[PDB]
């Protein structure tokens with residue numbers, strides 16, 4: 001049919017905290033039933049390391065399969081822009097398909113975090129909007145979360161990174177809360193994880209004036 | 211590789227202003243010399259229509275032809291859900307290729323437009339940012355703009371639309387200006403164009419106070 005490959009980068013959060021594990025997925029689509037014999041081969045700066053592991057395919061319920069491999073990586077490795085090449089061999093595919101990825105190039109720029117109170121003209125509604133504006137950062141790989149009293153709030157959405165005119169990125173994070181718990185003077189905070197921050201983590205709190 | 215067809219919708223602003231001309235564009239690529247002929251058939255909710263406008267072939271440096279057909283649509287036909295289908299036929303295709311576009315099926319929701327003054331903390335750079343918050347709208351087709359004193363303020367960026375948890379949409383627009391204005395009580399206004407806003411427009415002013 002049409003076995004094409006797709007290489008994906010690790011998650012931003014995973015390369016910043018050594019607690020978690022950053023990976024490179026090498027998803028191969030449209031695998032034929034006939035010859036489902038797909039092989040993999042990794043290269044770290046064309047050095048070919050060994051440690052990756054494969055997975056059990058699935059049925060794309062459209063007469064095709066979908067194999068996918070994943071290779072673990074060192075946090076500093078990936079951060080220092082090394083290359084990750086994933087070659088997808090095959091016994092029934094024209095030739096050796098390949099793809100490579102690495103982190104965006106350029107000097108990391110430190111994000112500037114600001115929290116914004118909900119507009120008074122929203123006080124009427126039953127729920128208000130807490131706003132976290134993260135701008136001026138490079139590269140765009142970033143993570144955002146909101147919390148309260150150490151506990152993690154989950155009713156929020158974050159717009160993806162947007163290229164600014166100066167070449168850095170920005171985004172907004174919106175947290176939704178019952179108007180009541182905002183007048184009570186509760187405290188909410190925006191957390192931003194990024195390689196350019198000291199200790200890869202910054203936090204700016206948001207609360208009511210009186 | 212046989213011909214490929216891509217269907218494009220009109221621009222959001224185009225469908226909200228009776229003065230604009232909303233168009234749906236059917237583009238065809240990868241048409242070799244062996245069979246350069248292409249036929250276009252248009253359907254509006256299934257009934258074939260013939261008011262299109264098809265431009266003639268156009269070579270593409272890669273030895274393949276590109277053909278494009280344009281269909282003008284009525285503002286209300288669009289805002290009302292009508293579906294447009296483009297059938298492309300090529301003497302080298304097993305079967306004709308068809309594509310269909312429309313306004314996302316749903317029920318329009320009026321967008322909430324709030325403005326936000328900059329954070330006191332950011333008040334330390336030669337530039338500041340005024341925020342425009344637009345939430346609770348559907349469908350996601352929208353348009354945002356900033357202007358101060360009638361004139362258009364061009365140094366801004368709008369985030370793309372983000373699906374909220376209630377199913378509606380929201381976005382943020384950022385207007386970056388010199389703190390050497392904001393401090394001088396200047397007034398900035400954020401305008402939004404959407405199908406669910408009376409007269410398809412609304413405006414919110416942000417001022418220093």
Ligand SMILES: *[C@@H]1O[C@H](CO[C@H]2O[C@@H](C)[C@@H](O)[C@@H](O)[C@@H]2O)[C@@H](O[C@@H]2O[C@H](CO)[C@@H](O[C@@H]3O[C@H](CO[C@H]4O[C@H](CO)[C@@H](O)[C@H](O)[C@@H]4O[C@@H]4O[C@H](CO)[C@@H](O[C@@H]5O[C@H](CO)[C@H](O)[C@H](O)[C@H]5O)[C@H](O)[C@H]4NC(C)=O)[C@@H](O)[C@H](O[C@H]4O[C@H](CO)[C@@H](O)[C@H](O)[C@@H]4O[C@@H]4O[C@H](CO)[C@@H](O)[C@H](O)[C@H]4NC(C)=O)[C@@H]3O)[C@H](O)[C@H]2NC(C)=O)[C@H](O)[C@H]1NC(C)=O
Nearest residue numbers: 006008009010011022023024025027029030060062064066
């Ligand atoms: C049969 O059915 C198949 C499967 O069906 C599914 O899909 C539809 C058909 C749907 O209707 C359902 O039926 C069903 O859901 C179907 O396969 C599909 O084929 C498509 C065509 O090839 C594939 O499209 C590609 O998608 C890429 C993006 O993939 C991500 O996003 C999709 C959509 O959300 C998602 O489905 C994928 O899973 C994938 O998500 C990411 O996945 C990785 C790996 O798991 C995650 O990362 C890991 O996560 C773990 C978590 O534990 C951990 O954190 C690890 O650290 C981490 O690594 C991510 O989290 C996850 N992210 C997200 C957001 O979800 C596209 O990139 C790709 O686009 C490129 O190629 C296009 C042409 O092919 C081109 O037009 C396009 O422009 C683009 O090209 C690139 O452009 C860039 C800039 O724009 C440039 O920078 C590049 O240079 C340039 N490159 C190239 C080569 O051009 C492409 O569109 C689709 O993914 C695939 N679906 C599935 C489910 O596999 C098949 O087509 C059907 N067959 C037939 C005949 O119909």
Ligand SMILES: *[C@@H]1O[C@H](CO[C@H]2O[C@@H](C)[C@@H](O)[C@@H](O)[C@@H]2O)[C@@H](O[C@@H]2O[C@H](CO)[C@@H](O[C@@H]3O[C@H](CO[C@H]4O[C@H](CO)[C@@H](O)[C@H](O)[C@@H]4O[C@@H]4O[C@H](CO)[C@@H](O[C@@H]5O[C@H](CO)[C@H](O)[C@H](O)[C@H]5O)[C@H](O)[C@H]4NC(C)=O)[C@@H](O)[C@H](O[C@H]4O[C@H](CO)[C@@H](O)[C@H](O)[C@@H]4O[C@@H]4O[C@H](CO)[C@@H](O)[C@H](O)[C@H]4NC(C)=O)[C@@H]3O)[C@H](O)[C@H]2NC(C)=O)[C@H](O)[C@H]1NC(C)=O
Nearest residue numbers: 216218219220221232233234235237239240270271272274
């Ligand atoms: C041979 O050469 C051909 C010519 O290419 C030349 O390009 C030059 C730039 C240069 O590189 C030359 O050297 C080169 O020769 C080449 O043709 C190209 O083929 C590509 C495919 O291989 C086409 O790619 C598709 O592009 C789509 C978007 O195209 C628009 O945006 C690009 C910029 O990124 C622009 O270049 C295009 O021309 C096009 O512009 C839009 O045009 C429309 C109509 O003209 C405008 O609309 C009108 O605008 C006016 C304003 O005056 C007015 O407002 C009207 O009202 C309005 O209607 C748009 O404004 C304009 N947009 C912009 C930004 O300018 C992609 O969407 C498409 O991706 C889709 O398909 C992929 C699969 O391949 C898939 O991976 C991807 O996810 C996506 O799928 C869609 O996903 C959606 C979900 O998000 C779904 O909703 C959709 O249903 C789903 N669709 C499908 C089908 O699945 C794809 O990447 C490329 O456009 C084309 N180039 C041109 C100029 O047409 C050819 O390939 C070459 N062949 C070979 C063998 O080399």
